Amino acid sequence: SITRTRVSRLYGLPAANPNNGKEYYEVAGRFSLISLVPSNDDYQT
């Protein structure tokens, strides 16, 4: 909201100060990758 102003009780996160005084936000978890790379000790069973 913005006090002294009738435009109040809206939703969203403002662009005025999105950090809320914090140096950073963090999100942590697992990473699962399937990539294509060279091959070694192969050409047979």
Partner 1 sequence: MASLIYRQLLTNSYTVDLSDEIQEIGSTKTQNVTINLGPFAQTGYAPVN
The distance of closest approach from Cβ of residue 36 to partner 1 in the complex, given in angstroms and rounded to an integer, is: 9
**Whether 8 contacts 1, CB under 8 Å:** yes
CB of 42 vs partner 1, minimal distance in Å: 7
Distances (CA, A) of 33 to 5, 14, 36, 39: 51, 35, 10, 17
42 binds partner 1 (CB under 8 A): yes
- Alpha-carbon gap, residue 29 to 37, rounded angstroms: 25
Q: How far is the CB of 43 from partner 1 (least distance, A)?
A: 6
Tell me, by CB under 8 A, how many residues bind partner 1. Answer: 4
Q: For binding to partner 1 (CB under 8 A), which residues are involved?
A: 42-45
